[PDB]
Design an enzyme around this catalytic site. Structure first.
Site: not given
Lengths: 504, 505
Positions: A229-230
């Protein structure tokens, strides 16, 4: 006969690798050497000489005495246990005055800090026939033609040994606590792109050679990841630039159906019709899939390309991996929006994240400060800040930073374990499934995750970016999913800002 | 996942390296796994599981049970003893049907012959996170971009595994007899330059990784030597071409005084006024120093340069050393004439020697036959015979061979230990002092020599050149001085000649 190999230096001039004089044990065991001599000049007592040398070199007495009992030999040496011994080992043996025993001076490569930026600094290897050193990995290999000499050239890195201690110590704690199969942390000057610290686990010790070869890949430059999710931040930035992202506009949370597959927000149930800002603070996959839909699948692939992905960053490490953008179909497309299918290097994540703190300009990360010869004073190379691209405007960058702020600091935040008291922290959390190496699908298990965090502080006007990642904890995998890499981000970041005199 | 890595092949198409599927054992040790399951899916009896697994993998049972005792862990693995397991280890463990136990498939790089041309073939190393293989040395490294994949490309070597066996077995014998610090042997097609076999000691096993890294240097391409008296053949060739060498002309043997150093024939006293041909049979240093004088020191430095020395042969091995011609003063020049001061690679030695058997043409040695992809059939590269230079005429080459014949077969020969029964052998012997690594001068000791022999057979019209070299025997150092490398040259040469169907007598 060999020229001194050049030194590897940190940014403040601390020695990270250097040539030294060590010593090698030699035992004459033949009586011809002591013919015209009053005192013996060969080993007359193999048993006692074997017992005395065992008190300096790490060999059992029976093995020493066995090596001493070899027939048809003039003098014998003792393998790896008989070389690379210190000046003090030399004097201790010499005071014994064992007949037939001497120490020969030999050059070795010395890494004063031992296991320390190991996968970045690398290791040089010795040819015992000639004493020629040759780098087998990392800087020692990349710059071998320069380091090898008459004196070779020095290489100065941007690494700060003070900040590197913080990273090394924080990774050590992650290993003891989580026993992960892969683990890295990197600290980058948020405004210049210099790599101030980098380490990974597992790794080796260049001084001893322990575990060298067990993993060739430098995680920063050569390993590839589905980041998790970065990665949402780059689709976040794109949707902002294209008018798709409105902080207060509401969207349908829950799940979406993509090619007969059900992809849902991490909590399965979603949160109903909620604002986009709250969707990002929550790391909502439905948000990112909705954002993708509104931007268009064609445009979004180019968005990830302008942010540097799918391509090498053209750094100074050998064999830099290019990654790949997973866009062959809509399932790959939609899962790329939250950091699966697409694979990246950590150095690419640093380059792209740097855009939000430099008015939209990505900074090309770099770790080589200088290559220069200290005798001739010739400078072969000088590293510098270099813009890698400008995929977003200053306005888009500032709005992204507002959401990253919220990720950690929103009253509804799920990343409060990354707050540091006295410092304003911001960044993005990641949880990602890991592809099994021998094909098929994903690694199975209760928490088979690659957890990460892309953070920076002080918020809005950061000094450093700290990116840490942990793949497949084999211990405390429940906690690993809960807290991500906060147990490394917090000490690294806190100690770094304090070391950089950032006001507490 | 990872594309299949290309194979490394010998010239007959036998596999020297390839990807295989091995297996890794995994033990689920947590009770959550057997929640909604009739049979257990975790180790319920860790003691008995530790005792059954101990019968397949090489780890103690107490260590198995200890590894199974890890807290806050779902599944545990077992380190090096627990991976790279065969299909038979797999079937053996699975037949046990131990709960919580499985075998996971992992790709490995497999070297079917184990320790075999090791320093040439190299070794690829696995990134366990991804299974990505990357070459760390030799062909695996040099050609890593082609071998890595779809399917990667195959690399075909000129090596003949049949001849490589002979070399491996013969080096193993030299180690047992002489325990030398360095030792190499190479077999080259005398008419094409193809490397038919090559090995060195010490070396590593690419399959197991044993001793990998202890010596990065490939002796053929990257190590350098003061060759000793094998080098006399190139000063010999020059004197022949320049008219300075007359076989029956007499010269004063014994010693010469060169810049405050006294260099003498190996017997200190020499043999008085003896013919030049006989001086070469005896490995006379005074002969070669006399030869330099008649040619001139400027002319002789250019002579060794036209023979390829001081320069890389620009082969396909990475970091090939160039050596250097030792000419800074008359002492270095005169000692270069019999193979000291100057340093060379074995591959330069092969290249220069081949001139004597190809009407004066040096052949560029080569070991890569093909790089090609087996799916697409694209050929990226094809090796071939290539002239590296022609430093001598056909007549000079033939006159050199007559002296090499004499070295081994003259009734006054000091090299009769290199004769093989049933075959006609020729070549040149070498004995050389070795530079100490920690500066100064040469290694000290009773016989501190790098002994060598550059041979070929059948003589005059050879099939192969066989060059073997042994540095600093630590056992039987007296015999090492007496016999040189005859105890490797003879088995290698004899077995290779037989395998190539050369008629024996």
């Amino acid at each position: 006969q060999q020229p001194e190999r050049g030194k590897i230096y940190d940014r403040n001039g601390k020695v990270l690798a250097e040539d030294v004089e060590r010593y090698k044990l030699v035992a004459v065991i033949d009586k011809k050497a002591s013919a015209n001599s009053k005192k013996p000049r060969h080993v007359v007592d193999k048993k006692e000489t074997a017992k005395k040398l065992s008190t300096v070199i790490d060999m059992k007495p029976e093995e020493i005495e066995k090596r001493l009992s070899q027939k048809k030999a003039f003098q014998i040496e003792f393998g790896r246990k008989g070389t690379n011994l210190t000046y003090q080992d030399k004097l201790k043996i010499e005071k014994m005055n064992l007949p037939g025993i001497s120490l020969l001076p030999e050059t070795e490569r010395f890494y004063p800090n031992g296991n320390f930026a190991s996968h970045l600094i690398g290791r040089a290897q010795k040819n015992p026939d000639t004493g020629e050193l040759k780098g087998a990995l990392g800087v020692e290999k990349i710059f071998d033609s320069y380091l090898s000499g008459k004196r070779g050239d020095d290489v100065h890195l941007t690494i700060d040994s003070n900040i590197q201690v913080f990273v090394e110590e924080a990774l050590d704690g992650m290993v003891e606590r989580y026993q992960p199969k892969d683990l890295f942390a990197v600290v980058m000057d948020a405004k210049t792109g210099e790599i101030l610290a980098y380490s990974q686990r597992p790794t080796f010790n260049p001084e001893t050679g322990k575990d060298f070869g067990k993993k060739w890949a430098n995680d920063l430059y050569q390993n590839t990841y589905e980041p998790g999710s970065t990665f949402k931040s780059y689709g976040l930035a794109a949707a902002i630039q294209e008018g798709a992202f409105d902080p207060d506009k509401k969207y349908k949370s829950g799940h979406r159906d993509i090619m007969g597959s059900r992809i849902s927000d991490w909590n399965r149930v979603g949160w109903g019709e909620i604002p986009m800002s709250l969707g990002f603070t929550y790391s909502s996959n439905t948000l990112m899939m909705h954002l993708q839909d509104l931007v268009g699948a064609d445009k979004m692939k180019s968005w990830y390309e302008r942010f540097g992905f799918g391509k090498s960053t053209k750094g100074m490490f050998d064999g830099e991996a290019p990654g790949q953008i997973g866009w062959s179909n809509e399932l790959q497309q939609k899962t790329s929006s939250f950091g699966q299918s697409t694979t990246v290097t950590p150095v690419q994540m640093l380059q792209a994240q740097s855009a939000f703190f430099n008015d939209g300009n990505m900074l090309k990360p770099w770790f080589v400060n200088s290559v220069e010869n200290p005798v001739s004073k010739r400078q072969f190379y000088k590293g510098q800040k270099q813009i890698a691209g400008k995929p977003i405007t200053k306005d888009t960058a500032e709005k992204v930073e507002k959401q990253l702020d919220l990720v950690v600091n929103s009253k509804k935040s799920h990343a409060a374990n990354y707050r540091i008291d006295g410092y304003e922290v911001e960044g993005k959390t990641g949880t990602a499934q890991v592809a099994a190496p021998n094909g098929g699908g994903y690694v199975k298990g209760p928490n088979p995750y690659f957890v990460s965090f892309m953070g920076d502080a002080p918020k809005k006007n950061p000094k450093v970016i700290v990116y840490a990642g942990m793949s497949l904890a084999q211990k405390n995998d429940q906690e690993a999913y809960e807290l991500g890499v906060s147990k490394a981000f917090k000490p690294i970041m806190e100690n770094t800002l304090k070391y950089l005199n950032v006001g507490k």
